[PDB]
């Protein structure tokens, strides 16, 4: 689930 941080999430 490191790909969540690669892909990002902001709004």
């Amino acid at each position, epitope marked *: 689930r*490191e790909n*969540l941080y690669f892909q990002g999430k902001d709004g």
Partner: antibody
Amino acid sequence: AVQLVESGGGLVQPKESLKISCAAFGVTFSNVAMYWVRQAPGKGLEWVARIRTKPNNYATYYADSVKGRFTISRDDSKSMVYLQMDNLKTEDTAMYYCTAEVATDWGQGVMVTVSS
Amino acid sequence: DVVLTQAPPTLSATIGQSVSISCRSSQSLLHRNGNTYLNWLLQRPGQPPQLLIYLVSRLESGVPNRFSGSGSGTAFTLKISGLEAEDLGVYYCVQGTHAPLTFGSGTKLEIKR
């Protein structure tokens, strides 16, 4: 392995200040909005402050109860998030947790107690 | 802010029984990117929250097979299939699809014995 580690916090008098921080390890947090979340003793979890990423101008937002007293900031070069808490009130007494908008990884929390 | 209505507030059951918790959202949690950022957290007394389930159904590393999450849109479910003694504590749903992060009010699980 992803990890968040909080520091700072302790006992403080009403109207005093405290700065707590959150160090991220193991993968960049640059692409995620970051949050401080708190839990008053025996209560549930609630967001306190929010900071956006560089593309969104690092915009900051606050729960109504802390607006104009708490300031959230991040230093992406150091993988650090901070909460400056000014004019502290007894009802700010809580465990404070740092987390990203994906809400998958959590620090151990720091206790902030506000009492005379 | 998105309201997560969590039910029931308490659960009690014997070892080996199944229990379910409901998390119902005021807004669809499907993000425009296609992911649904709804997770389930467990908090043991005097401990930080820890991740059980993320992105609706994905099991966190180290979490036993008996935990499962499901749902879509505005309605979600956590199920424990065969309670064990160590499963007690407070369960919360949390969403990060729509900023700010918001939380259900928590379900306290007790064991009947």
